[PDB]
Amino acid sequence: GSHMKTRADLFAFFDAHGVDHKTLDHPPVFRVEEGLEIKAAMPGGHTKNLFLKDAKGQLWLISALGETTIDLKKLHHVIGSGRLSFGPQEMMLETLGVTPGSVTAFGLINDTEKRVRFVLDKALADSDPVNFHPLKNDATTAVSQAGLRRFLAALGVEPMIVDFAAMEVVG
Template sequence: MELTLETGRPSDTTGRLEKEIRVYDFLDSLNIPYQRVDHEALMTIEACKDVDKILDAVICKNLFLCNRQETNFYLLLLPGDKKFKTKEISSQLGVARLSFGNETYMEKYLDITPGSVSVLGLMNDKEHHVQLLIDEDLLKEPYIGCHPCINTSSLKIDMKDMMEKIIPAMEHEPIFVKLGQEE
């Protein structure tokens, strides 16, 4: 399949899910410019490598996490090539033990499924069940690559727009963390 970099939302939305269209509506309402690549379903960071090259943006690893009691939920954004250690993030947050969150909560709070996890899912979390965590190294990147809540498209968004317009509009104040300190 030929991967093509497009600007903005698809002109034909036939066959696209409502949650994907809501992302385009949201970005357009904020006047956020973005580029898009449509592709086959990508379930892992490794599968995103070709799309990464076309977007020329760091593909962001998005991890949906929770505490042992499943009462606190987190969305951790970190560079795709960075290793994640639960102990490291748990100690920075002062949380006993974090693990990967159940997909039931992921769908309930963010309206996304495994393989499609994205910071843009926070636009669906109106009741603020999920705390946004961002690895500081991600902020060094000029652009961020993320899914529009579905893993058959990837978006390239200016990091400045993400931090100054999109995240504030979703009303999720991030906590910044430093991962990879224990290497």
Template sequence: MSSIFIDPQIYTGRPASAEGRLDKEMAVYDLLDKLEIPFTRVDHEVAMTIEDCQGVDQLLGIEICKNLVLCNTQKTKFYLLLMPGDKQFKTKDLSKQIGSSRLSFAPAEYMEKLLNVTPGSATVMALMNDLENQVQLIIDEDVTAQEEFGCHPCINTSSLKMKTADVLQKFLPAVHHEAIFVKL
């Protein structure tokens, strides 16, 4: 097993205690509980990249999504792209489908301001922090084809597994976000 794990234990639901946890992480668990979305969780060392998450994928039996926060050149339009971790991101393929040219990675300060996450912690769960709907969610259709969905709870020291249908049908409506579906 990967050395990323402090304790390679799979837990059902939220941590027993909030001690040592960030408020934004606990807020994710609160919302998932309120929406009655069951999930399993594993805690681990900081996982900044998809490569870091490979052991997590194996332990949870899923493929954690690649989560990219993007923006246009003027930094007036922001996007959260979810795509399979093993797919290569090509800006031109996405730009064509969403009608926005010159996409680039959003600077860290915009990730924090709009989603309350830092680089390496981007996640669909962060849309709960985008109260003004400034970030457009974009999902590669291959992500929706998977029965189960993996993501971080707004911090990259834990990973969650839940039903993809729960994310699409319960979580997104609750946080008032709609996805644009693309094929990359």
């Protein structure tokens, strides 16, 4: 809809659920910096966000670390069906209504319609942990594999693992 969540609700959201995650009030990037200094504490950050949608109409969020080269060609092949392909960003702005770049970070927050499934890459689920660039692009946010559990458990989302190398679900 025409309503996007805000930090006031986000910070309080994870604060009310006592999630194992904790947002960092770090400053933005003024000069050429990859967050190497903070990286020492956060093994994530330089992650990638994929935006795809199935033929059924549901969107799929596939997050992977910035170390491996995700194979979109082998992504859909993992299942064969679903017609998973690059979807129009407009779909993420209407459902997730977030900023361009990392909609999988806090896309579920805005997606209160129980839509859009959260898919974690075998490499991303390897404890990136899951640092992404949500609406709070101004600040950093890290959530351990144990954190998202309480995050999706509230929204009603079920995280799934898929190893592009194994061509199957890692459950």
